[PDB]
Paper text:
One such peptide, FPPQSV (peptide 1), derived from Prevotella species, has been shown to induce significant changes in gene expression and enhanced colonization when bound by AliD. Hence, peptides bind to OBPs, however, peptide-binding occurs with a low affinity when both, the fluorescently labelled AliD and the peptides as ligand are in solution and binding experiments are conducted at 25° C. The crystal structure of the AliD:peptide 1 complex was obtained by co-crystallization at 2.18 Å resolution. The asymmetric unit contained two monomers (chains A and B) with virtually identical structures (rmsd of 0.14 Å for 564 Cα atoms superposition). In these structures, AliD monomers adopt a closed conformation, resulting in a complete engulfment of peptide 1 between the two protein lobes without contact with the bulk solvent. The ligand-bound and unbound forms of AliD retained the three-dimensional structures of the individual domains unaltered, as both conformations were related by a rigid-body rotation of ~20° of Lobe 1 (Domain III) relative to Lobe 2 (Domains I and III). These polar interactions are complemented by several hydrophobic interactions facilitated by aromatic residues such as Y50, Y51, W498, F481, F518 and Y519 (located in pockets P1-P3), resulting in the tight binding of the initial five residues of peptide 1 to the AliD protein. Consistently, we observed an increase in the B-factors of the substrate from the N- to C-terminus, along with the presence of two different conformations for the sixth residue in the substrate.
Given the auxotrophic nature of pneumococci for certain amino acids, the Ami ABC transporter system, orchestrating oligopeptide uptake, becomes indispensable in host compartments lacking amino acids. The system comprises five exposed Oligopeptide Binding Proteins (OBPs) and four proteins building the ABC transporter channel.
Numbering used by the authors:
A (entry chain A): 29 to 652
B (entry chain E): 1 to 6
The structure:
């Protein structure tokens, strides 16, 4: 019926500890079970959640939230545990900070006194700027004004937690058991079974239950190997939605039956990219047979000309053409970590300012165009010219050619294997097989996670070259650039680098320069455009030095669905505005037509801009 | 934050 959403999930959640872990595989579940202060409407605005009202002081340093009194904690079986109280938000911050939360960078230098508490300069948590004024009133005091602070509250590190429940659970809080957490969101977790099934049930006593349409959400684990019978399960009526893959063995019959139902998503908040390992130590998944090969590859990835040569030879259209259509491949393309229209800088977009900083860095960037839905980088002649310069400097260091680059892939996901094999075919043909060889290491899902995506330390990452992403956490360009800073960036590990042990290689690469540019940008809090311009300079550094090679965004791909379009929560940042938030999602009996979808998108476009204007003006009513 | 399905 319209009350049951049935689909698939492909991630491997590892923990429901929403205060210590902020990997999306986990928070995509948590967002339906735990509410924060605010959430997102279907237009992208921030709207009340647990907080029914809020205020900010004139100096922008004090944010006060009023908790609605019918906000309650429930156990997994649905029984009420306790009303949510403002002290639960103080407990959340202290627990997340005392246990070195993965997401600690979002609050460490923003909440007043928190950095002094973290470093041990002052161990009195009463001096930290989070307080419970009474049971319904929580107050955050900041180190500096942050217009994006309210957007930060849609991340789970800023979610509340009951202190009595946390202390009695102790070590057993936030495991993979539904009984390891308390529930304050629209749904209860009926069942989780790893690599099998997820089931939600609507919470009848949730304060906003009258807005929750879908009563049951059933997700079955999907490897990504049989891209087919998801469409057959959609035909059966077993599934509410099914992706359609043009490179499947039956797309011909699938297209002619669903010709009027195939719809394409929008580009959303995930920024995808390729990156090098510049400090590889683990060598358990490699086609290299000798030290000379390993020494050669290690020196090559540290050469700027080599990285630019690979960057200019990587055809992003071909990589996207393997999963999506050969025509539809260009829809997903993205050339920056910060979306080019994420912010405006005077009369310029962010991407336009980045390109203006980029052209001043070298003639290899003249004419650069970082717009969406097109490949800014691919250029065979500049790739070959860069590699010729790289080849002459690497031979002086005793580097043998061809260079072997390892890239690890999930063997079971056919999209990833064929995509990485297209990068192999492109890079080997543009640069020459006598100059570079791409060795695609097909690993099991567990194995790939053990040595790449979920590798415990930076020295455990077993590759020379990888494909990863990042989701915006708050409304500021720093959210896409801070993760790669060499002081405390959470994603510094993907380069194989550790902030303490690898400081001379960090300086050798110029990552100290990049970190200082971000620190220089972060000090700008009165002139917001100047702040954006200085983050644009840092984005230009990352593009030019080619440790990161931006590729595409999520979304922009094809599917057939029974989900009524543009009803779910929507956001550019946070965990409360993506396709995993079922609260506002609505289902229909008939399959969505391309006519219905494109008309809804047009009106959603109009109504969102009108709604965003009104919410920006209404927000001034809260400055009291 | 780190992405899904990667
Ligand atoms: Zn009841
Ligand atoms: Zn009701
Ligand atoms: Zn039911
Ligand atoms: Zn050896
Ligand atoms: Zn340069
Ligand atoms: Zn030269
Ligand atoms: Zn040598
Ligand atoms: Zn920092
Ligand atoms: Zn200015
Ligand atoms: Zn300027
Ligand atoms: Zn509306
Ligand atoms: Zn208001």
């Amino acid at each position: 019926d319209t009350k049951t959403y049935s689909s698939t999930f492909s991630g491997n959640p590892t923990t429901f500890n929403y205060l210590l872990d902020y990997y999306a595989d986990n928070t995509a579940i948590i967002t339906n079970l735990v509410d924060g202060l605010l959430e997102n409407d279907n237009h992208g605005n921030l709207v009340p959640s647990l907080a029914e009202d809020w205020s900010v002081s004139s100096d922008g340093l004090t944010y006060t939230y009023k908790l609605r009194k019918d906000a309650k904690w429930f156990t997994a079986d649905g029984e009420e545990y306790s009303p949510v109280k403002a002290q639960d938000f103080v407990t959340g911050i202290k627990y997340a900070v005392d246990n070195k939360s993965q997401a600690i960078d979002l609050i460490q230098n923003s909440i007043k006194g928190l950095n002094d508490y973290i470093t041990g300069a002052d161990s009195d948590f009463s001096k930290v700027g989070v307080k419970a004024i009474d049971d319904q009133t929580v107050e955050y005091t900041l180190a500096r004004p942050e217009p994006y602070w309210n957007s930060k509250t849609t991340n789970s590190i800023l979610f509340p937690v009951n202190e009595e429940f946390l202390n009695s659970k102790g070590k057993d809080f936030g495991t993979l058991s539904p009984d390891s957490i308390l529930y304050s969101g629209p749904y209860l977790l009926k069942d989780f079974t790893s690599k099998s099934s997820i089931e939600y049930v609507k919470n009848p006593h949730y304060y906003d239950h009258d807005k929750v349409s879908i009563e049951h959400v059933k997700l079955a684990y999907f490897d990504g190997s049989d891209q087919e019978l998801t469409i057959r399960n959609f035909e059966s009526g077993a599934y509410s939605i099914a992706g359609v893959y043009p490179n499947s063995s039956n797309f011909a019959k699938t297209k002619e039956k669903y010709k009027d139902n195939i719809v394409y998503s929008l580009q959303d908040k995930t920024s995808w990219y390729f990156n090098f390992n510049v400090n590889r130590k683990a060598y358990n998944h490699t086609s290299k047979t000798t030290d000379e090969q390993k020494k050669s590859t290690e020196t090559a990835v540290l050469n700027k000309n080599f990285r630019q040569a690979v960057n200019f030879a990587l055809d992003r259209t071909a990589y996207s053409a393997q999963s999506n259509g050969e025509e539809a491949a260009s829809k997903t393309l993205l050339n920056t970590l910060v979306p080019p229209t994420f912010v405006q800088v005077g009369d310029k977009t962010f991407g336009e300012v980045v390109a203006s900083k980029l052209v001043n860095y070298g003639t290899e960037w003249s004419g650069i165009n970082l717009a969406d839905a097109q490949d800014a980088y691919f250029n065979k002649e500049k790739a070959q010219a860069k590699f010729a310069e790289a080849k002459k400097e690497l031979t002086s260091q005793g580097v043998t050619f061809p260079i072997h680059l390892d890239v690890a892939v999930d063997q079971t996901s056919k999209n990833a294997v064929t995509g990485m094999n297209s990068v192999k075919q492109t890079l080997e043909s543009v640069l020459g097989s006598d100059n570079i060889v791409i060795d695609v290491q097909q690993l099991s899902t567990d194995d790939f996670n053990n040595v790449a995506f979920l590798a415990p330390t930076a020295a455990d990452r077993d590759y020379d070259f990888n494909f990863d992403g990042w989701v915006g956490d708050y409304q500021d360009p720093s959210t896409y650039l801070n993760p790669f800073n060499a002081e405390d960036g959470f994603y510094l590990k993907i380069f194989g680098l550790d902030a303490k042990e690898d400081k001379e290689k960090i300086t050798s690469l110029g990552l100290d320069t990049y970190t200082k540019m971000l620190k220089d940008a972060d000090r700008e809090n009165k002139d917001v455009a100047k702040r954006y311009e200085k983050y644009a300079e840092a984005q230009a550094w990352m593009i030019d030095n080619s440790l990161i090679m931006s590729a595409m965004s999520s979304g922009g791909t094809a599917s057939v669905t029974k989900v009524t379009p543009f009803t779910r929560g929507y956001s550019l940042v946070g965990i409360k505005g993506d396709g995993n938030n079922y609260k506002y999602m609505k289902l229909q009996k008939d399959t969505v037509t391309t006519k219905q979808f494109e008309e809804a998108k047009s009106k959603w476009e109009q109504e969102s801009k009108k709604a965003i204007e009104k919410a920006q003006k209404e927000a001034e009513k809260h400055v009291k | 934050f780190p992405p899904q399905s990667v």
